[PDB]
Amino acid sequence: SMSVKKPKRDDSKDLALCSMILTEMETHEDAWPFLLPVNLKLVPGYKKVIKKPMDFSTIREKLSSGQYPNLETFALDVRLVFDNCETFNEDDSDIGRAGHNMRKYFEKKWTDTFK
Ligand SMILES: CC(=O)c1cccc(O)c1
Ligand SMILES: [Cl-]
């Protein structure tokens, strides 16, 4: 509360660490459904069903331009990619399996890096 400070977690390397994690996700062989925004004009259902589209290239643009106030907002966008994927794809489709794999990959990197 006012003039009562909780001890300061060092956040100075967060930007660099999120960038490295994102690089590792960008180069994973199962990243291909997530590299670019889903084409809303070529993919039936997507625009109406998925209220907040997100993809790796959009996360990268946002990270590169100061649009994440903190490491948790970055993680929320990453998770949104995989949450959207589950909403729109069957668990046992190539894209559906790619999403589950990439989520598992991300969360281990997240835990190992920050937690
Ligand atoms: C990421 C996703 O859910 C997707 C990507 C390309 C085509 C498609 O039908 C769905
Ligand atoms: Cl499917």
Q: Which two tokens mark 15?
A: 């930007």
Domains and CATH numbers, the chain: 1-115 (1.20.920.10)
If one counts every other C-beta atom within 10 angstroms of the C-beta of residue 9, the result is 8
| Most informative mutation of 57, 79, 89 for ligand 1 (most atoms within 8 A of CB) | 89
Give dist(CA 15, CA 19) in Å, integer.
Answer: 6
What phi, psi does 56 have (nearest 5°)?
Answer: -65, -40
Experiment type = X-ray
Of 85, 9, 87, 115, the C-alpha closest to 107 is 115
Q: How far apart are CA 19 and CA 10, in angstroms?
A: 17
Q: In Å, what is the CA distance from 4 to each residue of 7, 84, 100? A: 10, 40, 42
Kindly give, in sequence order, each residue whose CB lies less than 8 Å from that of residue 44, ignoring residues fewer than 6 positions away: none
- Report how far ligand 2's centroid is from the alpha carbon of 85 (Å): 10
Q: How much distance in Å is there from the Cα of 4 to the middle of ligand 1?
A: 48
- Report the residue among 85, 87, 97, 101 best suited for mutation to probe ligand 1: largest number of ligand atoms under 8 A from its CB: 85
Q: Which of 54, 49, 42 is nearest to 89 (CA)?
A: 49
